[PDB]
């Protein structure tokens, strides 16, 4: 584009960021990432997928995925589409702005440096991973060089974070992903 | 868009991607650089500006602004718009891609932590900054916790990495920014 940076979505997220959806449960709302992590493999983006609800309600905001190569642009991770479009949608760059439910960003996998600051600068509140950090190394993606102790970073700014949930179903999604190929490979690889 | 990832280019923006420029000297990169600082702040967007260049013949390649406010996207640095909009254009996530020449990110400042992970993914072979993560900081810009030597961190993935020209310029451009930032009235601003 000439005017404008512009990352376009495949269907099944245009959908995912147009579809009501309430999900009270954190194993709901990380039942439906991975939903996003399957899909988005069949579009051919990387095996990652995260999604913004409001903490408490668990309505969905918005949703990302990996969409790195066929969007040629290394910074198009999950957790920074997720992040920005759900920023679009409420119109502000700052999740946390007065008068706004808290927010909270559920990723497939722990988040590479990059994500990693992203998160920090968005307003979001929490942060609930599925895959760990080797789980995503052992199929061939960095996460890069992250700051020493950096979920201690985040819970010191105000972000709490879980890591483990239905980390073996998200393990079995990449797993599944490296055995079949992959294509140019997402980014942080 | 409401779907899409779509972050607006200011027109001095879309001009400075539209004319092909080659900046041979670094100090010509970088003072090119701050003067898309200045514009960028009578632009409404923060005090910050970065552009890709072919390190070796000193062509524009993608120019970037912080849009964070008026894009409604805290992801929106201008070393992410720089980087991603100079892959746009090259039409690959990865600006070390074989057949592409070798590029560099001129900053107007030291990278914070999530864009330390951007330039590590984008591809790019240099990094040149003027002014110095104490220097933002110090009119309250947040660089986020980054691992320790992350400059080493940068070399050591073949990354090489320049600070300080032309920082007396980017200085007086950030204090003149933060002068101006508050709410009550001042014809000077
Ligand atoms: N580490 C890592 N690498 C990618 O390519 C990703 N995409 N989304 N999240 C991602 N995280
Ligand atoms: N630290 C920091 N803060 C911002 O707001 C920026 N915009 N672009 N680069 C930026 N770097
Ligand atoms: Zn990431
Ligand atoms: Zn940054």
């Known amino acids: 584009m000439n005017d404008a940076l512009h990352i376009g979505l495949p269907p099944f997220l245009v959908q995912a960021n147009n579809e009501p959806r309430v999900l009270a449960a954190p194993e709901a709302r990380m039942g439906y990432v991975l ?28 949703a990302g995925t990996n969409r790195v190569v066929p969007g040629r642009c290394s910074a ?39 994500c990693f600051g992203a998160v920090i600068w968005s307003g979001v509140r929490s942060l609930v991973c599925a895959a760990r950090s080797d789980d995503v190394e052992a199929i061939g993606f960095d996460e890069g060089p992250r700051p020493e102790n950096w979920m201690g970073g985040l819970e010191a700014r105000g972000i709490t974070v879980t890591t483990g949930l239905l980390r073996d179903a998200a393990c079995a999604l990449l797993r599944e992903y490296n055995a079949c190929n992959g294509v140019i490979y997402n980014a942080r690889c």
Chains 1, 2 share one sequence.
């Open 35 to 62: 939903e996003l992590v399957r899909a988005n493999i069949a579009a051919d983006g990387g095996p990652f997928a995260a999604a913004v609800f409001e903490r408490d309600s668990g309505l969905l905001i918005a």
């Open 76 to 114: 198009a991770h999950a957790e920074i589409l997720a992040l920005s479009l759900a920023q679009a949608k409420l119109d502000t760059h700052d999740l946390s702005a007065d008068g706004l439910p808290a927010c909270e960003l559920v990723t497939s996998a722990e988040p590479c440096v990059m």
